[PDB]
Every structure is written in structure tokens, then in C-alpha cells.
From a paper:
Thiamine pyrophosphate (TPP) is the biologically active form of vitamin B1 (thiamine) and is essential for all living organisms. The same study also identified genes essential for growth on nutrient agar using high-density transposon mutagenesis, and found thiamine monophosphate kinase (ThiL) to be essential. In this study, we present high-resolution crystal structures of ThiL from the pathogen Acinetobacter baumannii (AbThiL) bound to substrate Thiamine monophosphate (TMP) and substrate analog adenylyl-imidodiphosphate (AMPPNP), and bound to its products TPP and adenosine diphosphate (ADP). The AbThiL structures assume the same two domain fold as MfThiL and AaThiLwith an N-terminal A domain and a C-terminal B domain.
Crystals grown in the presence of 5 mM AMPPNP/TMP/MgCl2 had many growth defects. Hence, co-crystals of AbThiL with 5 mM AMPPNP/MgCl2 from an optimization screen based on MCSG1 G4 (19% w/v PEG 3350, 200 mM K/Na-tartrate, 100 mM HEPES/NaOH pH 7.5) were soaked overnight with 5 mM AMPPNP/TMP/MgCl2. Crystals were harvested in two steps with reservoir with 20% v/v EG, 5 mM AMPPNP/TMP/MgCl2 added as the cryo protectant. The AMPPNP/TMP data set was collected at the APS LS-CAT beamline 21-ID-F equipped with a C(111) monochromator, and a Rayonix MX-225 detector. For the AMPPNP/TMP structure an anomalous signal could be detected for the potassium site, despite the weaker anomalous signal at shorter wavelength. For this structure, potassium was part of the crystallization condition. One metal that is in the center of the reaction is consistently magnesium: In the substrate complex a magnesium ion complexes both the scissile phosphoester bond in ATP, γ-phosphate and β-phosphate, and also the uncleaved β-phosphate and α-phosphate. Similarly, in the AbThiL substrate complex (AMPPNP/TMP), the α-phosphate group of TMP is already positioned for an in-line attack on the non-hydrolyzable γ-phosphate group of AMPPNP. In addition, we observed that the product complex (ADP/TPP) has a very similar conformation as the substrate complex. A superposition of the product complex and the substrate complex of AbThiL highlighs that the α-phosphate of TMP/TPP, and the α-phosphate and the β-phosphate groups of AMPPNP/ADP virtually do not move.
Residue numbers in the entry:
A (entry chain A), B (entry chain B): 1 to 305
Write the structure that this text describes.
């Protein structure tokens, strides 16, 4: 069982209809759907840094795909295919069975094909997935575009995964191990959201990228943050730290005019949406709690920080 | 200095006019050229396995791009853009300056844009580049197209990089550190070559992928293998070993009819071309030396083998 048999045994299932050439050649081939731009991203997962060392192989495979689909969704785009680059310290059939099952379970959930990649030996388990999607030309939702008066919104709940990481064994570890990329919501926000980012590093810092790109600020209402009932019972200063600086949420944070927010609520969405503040002219991120200014020092996840 | 400053300092030179959305958002955007297919590949380099630990950062950056442009060329396609996923143990400005210089030197040599990527901390230096190209729809040169009677050809020289690795300091180390992706030759072989692969693992093993995909065999003439004058002066047995199983060549091995070969030889090419054998009906790779069968056992590079 060497490199090429590993690819054949675990990573070479047939794709959905729309792949001109999948695994088996030097590159993969995709015939573009008409009137669409290619949307492309890549994110790396390092064992022990992006997931606890004892994470199940299935959850490693799932999250390796999910975090990349999240960046496709963050543009308003529809995901199509992925490449899988994996560096393995050892060949372990049971690990490979579960990891590949996790890859395919995530791909199949969101209609994505695995069309290529690379397999290497390395001293440390490292995974880089490239995701490819398509969007109607010119309709991508950028990190720029937020305007004064726009609502700030976030999907789902924030802080779950960060609580789960420090409370391994708690049910909220499911949000650490199995984030849900908000694929359909991202598509439903095309033409409604004025800006958008996915929350991989922490709501405050990721919103900050929108604020900097859009040259605006924001005031967030801390008691509106959508946190789990478990986090509603912990002291508020640490509740805010999980919610705003925890990261690993893979929810969508977006801005939207009040008028377009009304339109969005009229849709049938597969995740909840919460308005948590609004965009303002002054170029600072500030916080308010129960009607008063709430000074808060927050730092999201950043490598080498 | 931390993650986001690193990206801005080293990996964020002004984006191509030909890129709809470059670095700065959750994904990159590309507007497809009309009547062309997307060609996409990704290859990982692990420090100490894909290059000597002491390899200069500039050479590491160059080769990270080059090996991926090679897989675009192996399809007959024109390279367009890359993503860069790098995992670093430490922040070293002198290393990052050289490495990013090598990334951009290779991109600029071949007209390619760096449009996105990912930056992580990890315990071991690991790089995965994704390359994107475009090709006239339907015209990709596949590993499965070889036909009985086709010539087997290879560009440049084979065995240089493998000798270089075993003789660090020798001028042939430059073929290990700075392989040349054969981009223009790949484009010139669109519509002429019946099959093609780039020689990353070893000519015999990589030719073997074509033979299996095409359900054919090949007979190669050992004294026609294009090797460096340095290898012409070493013992024959080791010469064949370097040439046929050395790997790291990043030359193009292709099959072509005699008639299309004559057309190819009338073109202005930036690399030499050698006919080294021919495709036969029996599904075996055999070798001939001085007009007699030459039994030979070689194995190319394969992880975990
Ligand atoms: N883990 C993986 N998952 C899915 N596809 C893969 C994976 N590893 C490799 N592939 C595909 O399997 C085929 C063979 O891969 P590979 O041997 O890496 O090709 P190559 O890049 O041309 N050679 P090399 O440069 O030596 O790695 C290609 O079509 C790859 O895209
Ligand atoms: N080494 C790199 N080379 C080129 N572009 C890069 C590199 N690292 C990151 N980028 C780009 O820089 C921007 C910020 O990257 P990044 O923070 O990784 O985005 P993200 O994936 O949305 N967040 P995260 O999931 O936390 O990594 C994106 O446009 C990336 O494509
Ligand atoms: C063992 C362990 N320690 C810490 C974390 C938290 N974590 C790791 S990377 C990251 C941001 C996204 O990464 P990137 O920016 O590299 O895409 C976060 C919040 C974890 N999940 N597991
Ligand atoms: C230090 C050192 N040891 C060995 C080699 C040789 N080598 C490494 S990977 C590979 C095949 C291509 O890799 P992959 O199949 O992963 O793309 C070859 C020929 C080297 N260059 N440096
Ligand atoms: K490849
Ligand atoms: K490989
Ligand atoms: K976005
Ligand atoms: K990304
Ligand atoms: K990152
Ligand atoms: K090919
Ligand atoms: Mg190849
Ligand atoms: Mg991401
Ligand atoms: Mg490869
Ligand atoms: Mg991050
Ligand atoms: Mg993102
Ligand atoms: Mg390759
Ligand atoms: Mg990233
Ligand atoms: Mg190989």
C-alpha cells in the first residue's frame, strides 16, 4: 500500500455529472458554466494546530472540506469541486477509511466533487484543500461594500466551537469538529448583502476585515450576539471572549441594508440570522451593553501573534 | 510580525490586470476566457523530502511554482494563476524575502499571477501551490491517448537533478533546485502529441502511467536517452538509473505520430526534443541497447514505497 494505491483506494470515487476530467491525469479539467466567474480558495489544516491531535479522522476530513466551502459561501458563490493535498506521516488503513469518508460526507452534503490533489509523506499531518465554485459574473459579495447605516448580521451561533475546544467532551465539541459551511445562505445573500466574510478567526477580527476594506466602522450590541444557552450562563466578560474572539465558527458575518434585511427574512433559510449592530461612519469597532458603551479588548486568531 | 502583515509584506504584489479579484478577500475570482476549459492541479513540497533542508529560500520558492506549472504544461494548457498555501515554523524575514522573490521570479518568467493562498504556523516547512490554466475546449493532452506506432519523446535532459542530489555542489544541482517547467513546449504540443506526462518521479515510471492509461507498451533505446555529458562519462548502469528512475526532471514525456513529429520539429521551440522509443501493442515497457534486448529493473519515486 503505497501512494498510488492510497489514491485509488480512498480518494478516487466517481464525481457528479459536471467534471470534464477528474482524477488520473496531471491536472483536472472543468468546463465552465456559462456566464459565471471561477471562485477559488485554499486553506491548510495542521494537526495539533487546527484540530486537537486526537480528533477522529472522519472529523478531520469533514472540517478540511467545510472550512474551504465556507470561503466559497463567503463570496455568495456555489461550490463545485475541490482538490485535496495531504501529507501523511504513516499509512494507516483505518485512519484513511475514516478521513476519506469525512471528505466525501462533506462533499456529498454540498454537491461537491473531489477532482484531484496530491499525496505525500511528511513528518507531520498537514492537509490543504483547494475549493472551486462559480458565481454569476460580477455578483460576488466582497469584504468591501459595507455602507453607513447597514445592519451587521451573523448566521447561526458564535462562540460554540471556542467553548468546545476548551471543554473537550462537551456536546459543543461537535461545533469544533463539525462546523457547518453556510453554503445555501451564502447563495441567498448574493444580491442582498453589501459585504460578507466567514468567521474563521473570530467575529470581531473578521468583521474588522470588512470595516478596513469598506473604510467604515461598526457598533455591536453585545446582548444581541447569538450565543449558545451554555454560554448564556457563564460570566459575561468571558462570554464575549468566546463569542467575539473564539474563532472556528464558520458562520457568515455580513452587512445589509434594512430594506434588504426585510427581503432576506422573507426567504426560507436553513440557518438562523441575527442582527447584531450597524455600520457607522467613524472608523472604529465599538461595543455597547444594555445601552451603555462597553470598552472591550479583543484579539481574534492570528498565526505568529 | 504576524500572519496578516506577513501576507502584505511578501505575498501581496499588485494583482494582474487579467485577474477579476486578487488577494484580499475570502476567495479569488477569475473570468474564464471564452471557449476554454479550466486546468487545475496542486502539488505539495515538504522540507527535507522534496528539497534538501539547506536549500536556499529563493530556490524553494521557484521550485514550488515550477513543479505546478509543469502539470499545467503536461496537459498542453497555458498557465494563468496560482494559489500559495505555506506552513512556516518561524517568521524569518530574510528567508521570507528570498522565498517570495523565488515565487514571483517564477510567476513573472511564465506570465502567471499569484491571486490567493493561505498562511499558517506549523512544526515543519510545508508548501502547497495550486496552479490554474486554460486550454481550448476538448484539446487537452491526456495520459490515455497513446497509440501503437507513436514515437516516445522527451524534452531536455533526464537524470540531471537526480545526479545533482547525489552530488550537492555540482553544477547539476541547479537542475535539482531550479527545474524549468516546459510551458511553451506544452502549448506547442496541443493538437500534436497523442499523450503526455511530466517527468516528476522518473521517466520509466511516468511513461508507465501513459502506458497503463492508454493500454499500450513501449520499447525504449537506452543510448538515445538525452543525458548530460557528465552522465555520459559515468558507468552505463548508473547512467540509466539516473535517467530512468531519477525523477525531479520536470521534462515532458509525450507520444506523437511520425507525421506530427515532423510538424513539431519545424516549430521554433525553447528546448530540445529527443525521440527515445516507440509505442508497441504488447503491454510491457522494455529496453534496447545496441540493438539487443536489455533487461532492466528500475522503480521511480513513490511515497511510502
Ligand atoms: N489525495 C488525493 N486526492 C485526490 N486526488 C489525488 C490525491 N493525490 C493525488 N490525486 C490525483 O491522482 C493523480 C495522480 O497524482 P500525482 O501522482 O500527484 O500527479 P502528478 O502531480 O502529475 N505527479 P507528482 O508531481 O510526482 O506528484 C492526479 O490526477 C492527482 O490529481
Ligand atoms: N501566502 C499567501 N500567498 C498569497 N495570498 C495569500 C497567502 N496567505 C493568504 N493569502 C490571501 O490573503 C487573504 C487573507 O487570507 P486568509 O486570512 O487566509 O483568508 P481566509 O481563508 O478567509 N481566513 P482563514 O480561514 O482564517 O484562513 C486572502 O485573499 C488569501 O487568499
Ligand atoms: C488544537 C486547536 N487549537 C486551536 C484551535 C483554534 N484555531 C486554530 S486555527 C483557527 C483559525 C482558523 O485557522 P486559519 O487562520 O489557519 O485558517 C482557530 C480558531 C483549534 N481548532 N484546535
Ligand atoms: C532531499 C530530497 N530527497 C529526495 C528528492 C527526490 N524527490 C523528492 S519528491 C520526488 C518526486 C516528486 O515528488 P511528489 O511525487 O511528491 O510530487 C523526488 C524525485 C529530493 N528532491 N530531495
Ligand atoms: K498534479
Ligand atoms: K505526490
Ligand atoms: K467575501
Ligand atoms: K481563503
Ligand atoms: K490562515
Ligand atoms: K497529461
Ligand atoms: Mg504530472
Ligand atoms: Mg478560510
Ligand atoms: Mg502530485
Ligand atoms: Mg485565520
Ligand atoms: Mg474567509
Ligand atoms: Mg506534479
Ligand atoms: Mg486562509
Ligand atoms: Mg510523484
Amino acid at each position: 500500500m503505497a501512494e498510488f494505491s492510497i489514491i485509488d483506494q480512498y480518494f478516487n470515487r466517481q464525481s457528479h455529472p459536471d467534471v470534464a476530467l477528474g482524477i488520473g491525469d496531471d491536472s483536472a479539467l472543468i468546463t465552465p458554466p456559462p456566464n459565471q466567474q471561477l471562485v477559488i480558495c485554499a486553506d491548510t489544516l495542521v494537526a495539533g494546530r487546527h484540530f486537537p491531535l486526537e480528533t477522529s479522522p472522519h472529523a478531520i476530513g469533514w472540517k478540511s472540506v467545510a472550512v474551504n466551502l465556507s470561503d466559497i459561501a463567503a463570496m455568495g458563490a456555489k461550490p463545485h469541486s475541490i482538490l485535496l493535498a495531504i501529507s501523511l506521516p504513516q499509512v494507516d488503513h483505518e485512519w484513511l477509511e475514516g478521513f476519506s469518508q469525512g471528505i466525501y460526507d462533506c462533499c456529498n452534503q454540498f454537491g461537491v466533487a473531489l477532482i484531484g490533489g496530491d499525496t505525500t509523506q511528511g513528518p507531520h499531518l498537514t492537509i490543504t484543500v483547494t475549493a472551486m465554485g462559480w458565481i454569476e459574473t460580477g455578483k460576488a459579495v466582497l469584504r468591501s461594500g459595507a455602507k453607513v447605516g447597514d445592519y451587521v448580521c451573523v448566521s447561526g451561533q458564535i462562540g460554540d466551537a471556542a467553548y468546545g475546544l476548551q471543554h473537550l467532551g462537551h456536546s459543543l465539541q461537535q461545533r469544533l469538529d463539525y462546523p457547518t459551511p453556510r453554503c445555501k445562505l451564502g447563495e441567498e445573500l448574493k444580491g442582498l448583502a453589501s459585504s460578507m466574510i466567514d468567521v474563521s478567526d473570530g467575529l470581531a477580527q473578521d468583521l474588522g476585515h470588512i470595516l478596513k476594506a469598506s473604510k467604515v466602522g461598526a457598533r455591536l450590541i453585545l446582548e444581541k450576539l447569538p450565543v449558545d444557552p451554555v454560554l448564556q450562563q457563564i460570566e459575561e466578560q468571558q462570554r464575549w471572549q468566546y463569542a467575539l474572539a473564539g474563532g472556528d465558527d464558520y458562520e457568515l458575518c455580513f452587512t445589509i441594508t434594512p430594506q434588504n434585511y426585510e427581503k432576506l427574512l422573507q426567504k426560507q433559510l436553513d440557518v438562523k440570522i441575527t442582527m447584531i449592530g450597524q455600520i457607522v461612519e467613524q472608523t472604529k469597532l465599538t461595543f455597547e451593553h444594555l445601552g451603555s458603551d462597553y470598552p472591550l479588548q479583543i484579539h481574534g486568531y492570528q498565526h505568529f501573534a
